[PDB]
Structure 1
Amino acid sequence: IQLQYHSLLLIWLLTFNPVFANELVQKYLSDFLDLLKLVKITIKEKVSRLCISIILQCCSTRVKQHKKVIKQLLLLGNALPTVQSLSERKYSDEELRQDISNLKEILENEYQELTSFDEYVAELDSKLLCWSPPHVDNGFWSDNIDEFKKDNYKIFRQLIELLQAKVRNGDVNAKQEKIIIQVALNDITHVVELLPESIDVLDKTGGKADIMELLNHSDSRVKYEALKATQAIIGY
């Protein structure tokens, strides 16, 4: 605990300089998420305050690309939900509570400009999907169907590439990998049902072959998702 507190203090001191904070922001994209997880797990007021200060310094306006860094943190590490949970929780330390409130306000301001499309784009870039609300939201798919087909179906091509990578990674058949594969299959089925022009692009890019390969997967959920995608493709 003492070593972790000293490391957090050193990180905050380094991040006090905007140039060093900006350099460390790109050094580890998951550093903010790890710090938030450590702050949530740790019950020490001093450690939580140091973690909050370090997180704020990275997203502080002094550091370069403050808005971009804040948006990336909120999209990847779920900074807004963690900050909202921390605000609801009661902290004995007044300085830690003030830092948590400031971080929550910053996260809310960053998320106000952001939308579900930005979150979906970030998830696609990170190649991580765990059945997000947008995937199961019919309205989100209806209002984002044109966006997916935009730029010569760039989003559809990215989804097809992610599905192909998951199929290549299907040998491991990890639970997270299986969930990602199922989410990608559901997204492909939605993009085929709505604006079926992407179906031809997926077939050209081997999406149908990937779905057929996933139809023989050992996992029951993956097999069911692949069967549903095949039914949406040409099935009744």
Structure 2
Amino acid sequence: PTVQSLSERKYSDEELRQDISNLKEILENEYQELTSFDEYVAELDSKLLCWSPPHVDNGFWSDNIDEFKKDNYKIFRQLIELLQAKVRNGDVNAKQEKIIIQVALNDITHVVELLPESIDVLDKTGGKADIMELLNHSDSRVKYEALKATQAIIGYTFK
């Protein structure tokens, strides 16, 4: 993100402009060009989810919906289990657990907006309940993401 701002403010010096542009390309290209399913699962496995440029991007989620389906979006259900667990075990409101949650809620929101069939998965798992709990919880960023998750389920229940 820092480079993208820098690129805008060009200063008079040919070589400077050249360096800034080259650096913008390399950074951006290297991360995105990984397969989408791969990055998500690698993060899922470690339980060490982080925001990255393709996890705040809608396109990533659209291609990946199909990859999850193996027994009614088993991988999607994996992320829901994973999120539920973090809140309840290892408590909520301590720093480590707080990074994973905000990212996970962001990730879920995107798939639900895109797919109407994932609503079932949240109900079976019990994820539906867990969202409601994050709302009350401290940390502004976790609460924002939680609110966006609630709304995503909500739009679809009533038409």
Q: CA RMSD in A?
A: 5.4
Q: Within 2, Cα distance between the matches of 1:134 and 1:112? A: 7
Q: Secondary structure at the match of 1:136?
A: coil
Question: Which residue number corresponds to residue 173 of structure 1?
Answer: 93
Provide closer, same or farther for how the CA distance between residues 109 and 151 of structure 1 changes in structure 2, counting only shifts above 3 A: farther
- The superposition leaves residues 148-194 of structure 1 with CA deviations (integer Å, 9 ceiling, x where unpaired) of 33442111111111111121146352333212101111111112111
Q: Within 2, Cα distance between the matches of 1:233 and 1:112? A: 28
Q: Within 2, Cα distance between the matches of 1:89 and 1:232? A: 38
Q: Within 2, Cα distance between the matches of 1:228 and 1:113? A: 28
Q: Is the 8 A contact 2:87 2:97 kept in 1?
A: no
Provide closer, same or farther for how the CA distance between residues 212 and 88 of structure 1 changes in structure 2, counting only shifts above 3 A: closer
Q: Is the 8 A contact 1:91 1:97 kept in 2?
A: yes
- The superposition leaves residues 182-215 of structure 1 with CA deviations (integer Å, 9 ceiling, x where unpaired) of 1111111112111121111111211110000111
Q: Within 2, Cα distance between the matches of 1:161 and 1:196? A: 19
Q: Is the 8 A contact 1:156 1:202 kept in 2?
A: no
Deviation of 1:110 after TM superposition, in Å, equals 13
Q: Within 1, Cα distance between the matches of 2:155 and 2:114? A: 15
Q: Within 2, Cα distance between the matches of 1:136 and 1:112? A: 12
Greater fraction helix = 1
Provide closer, same or farther for how the CA distance between residues 101 and 190 of structure 1 changes in structure 2, counting only shifts above 3 A: closer
Provide closer, same or farther for how the CA distance between residues 106 and 177 of structure 1 changes in structure 2, counting only shifts above 3 A: same
* Greater relative contact order (CA < 8 Å, ≥ 6 in sequence): 2
Q: Is the 8 A contact 1:149 1:198 kept in 2?
A: no
Provide closer, same or farther for how the CA distance between residues 172 and 90 of structure 1 changes in structure 2, counting only shifts above 3 A: same
Provide closer, same or farther for how the CA distance between residues 83 and 123 of structure 1 changes in structure 2, counting only shifts above 3 A: farther
Deviation of 1:89 after TM superposition, in Å, equals 25
TM-score of the aligned structures, taking structure 2 as reference length: 0.71
Displacement over 6 Å in runs of 4+: 81-113
Provide closer, same or farther for how the CA distance between residues 87 and 128 of structure 1 changes in structure 2, counting only shifts above 3 A: farther
Provide closer, same or farther for how the CA distance between residues 84 and 199 of structure 1 changes in structure 2, counting only shifts above 3 A: closer
Provide closer, same or farther for how the CA distance between residues 127 and 95 of structure 1 changes in structure 2, counting only shifts above 3 A: farther
- The superposition leaves residues 91-138 of structure 1 with CA deviations (integer Å, 9 ceiling, x where unpaired) of 999999999999999999999996232121111011111112221122
Q: Is the 8 A contact 2:92 2:98 kept in 1?
A: no
Deviation of 1:217 after TM superposition, in Å, equals 0.7
Total equivalences in the alignment: 156
Deviation of 1:84 after TM superposition, in Å, equals 19
Q: Within 2, Cα distance between the matches of 1:204 and 1:107? A: 40
Q: Secondary structure at the match of 1:151?
A: coil
Q: Within 1, Cα distance between the matches of 2:18 and 2:138? A: 51
Q: Is the 8 A contact 2:105 2:146 kept in 1?
A: yes
Q: Within 2, Cα distance between the matches of 1:229 and 1:171? A: 20
Aligned-pair identity in percent equals: 100
Q: Is the 8 A contact 2:49 2:100 kept in 1?
A: yes
